[PDB]
Amino acid sequence: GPHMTEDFSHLPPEQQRKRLQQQLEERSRELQKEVDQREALKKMKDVYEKTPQMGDPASLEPQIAETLSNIERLKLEVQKYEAWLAEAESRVLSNRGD
């Protein structure tokens, strides 16, 4: 689509669960992006500890706690969503008509 909406309420219960999903694939993506380096950080230090000519470890301190404090606010979101799917779909399931 050209433009995107704001609230996903007006959206149906079928497409509503289609929002979190995607948004989830991201909330997790940006997570695996920080995790891939999360541990690489420690390595990004030694690299400087011996070859700081390519960077400084003092510049990996505000980044580490960031990747450790982010991974939290990240995964957390990657949870609510993965749990929202049910908290949302529940609406569909609820609505039945055997």
Curated annotation (Swiss-Prot):
Native source organism of the sequence: Homo sapiens
Region annotation (Disordered) ranges: 7-37
Residue ranges that the Swiss-Prot or TrEMBL entry lists as coiled coil: 5-98
Name of protein: Cdc42-interacting protein 4
Upregulation: Induced by adriamycin treatment and this effect is counteracted by HGF/SF. Expression is reduced during differentiation.
Span of the entire protein shown here: 388 to 481 of 601
Subcellular location: Cytoplasm, Cytoskeleton; Cytoplasm, Cell cortex; Lysosome; Golgi apparatus
Bias kind Basic and acidic residues: ranges: 24-37
Subunit structure: Interacts specifically with GTP-bound RHOQ. Interacts with DNM2 and PDE6G. Homodimerizes, the dimers can polymerize end-to-end to form filamentous structures. Interacts specifically with GTP-bound CDC42. Interacts with AKAP9, ARHGAP17, DAAM1, DIAPH1, DIAPH2, DNM1, FASLG/FASL, GAPVD1, LYN, microtubules, SRC, WAS/WASP and WASL/N-WASP. Interacts with the ligand binding domain of the thyroid receptor (TR) in the presence of thyroid hormone. May interact with CTNNB1 and HD/HTT.
Post-translational modification note: Tyrosine phosphorylated. Also phosphorylated by PKA.
Every REM-1 domain range: 10-87
Tissue: Expressed in brain, colon, heart, kidney, liver, lung, megakaryocyte, ovary, pancreas, peripheral blood lymphocytes, placenta, prostate, skeletal muscle, small intestine, spleen, testis, thymus and trachea.
Family: Belongs to the FNBP1 family.
Function statement: Required for translocation of GLUT4 to the plasma membrane in response to insulin signaling. Required to coordinate membrane tubulation with reorganization of the actin cytoskeleton during endocytosis. Binds to lipids such as phosphatidylinositol 4,5-bisphosphate and phosphatidylserine and promotes membrane invagination and the formation of tubules. Also promotes CDC42-induced actin polymerization by recruiting WASL/N-WASP which in turn activates the Arp2/3 complex. Actin polymerization may promote the fission of membrane tubules to form endocytic vesicles.
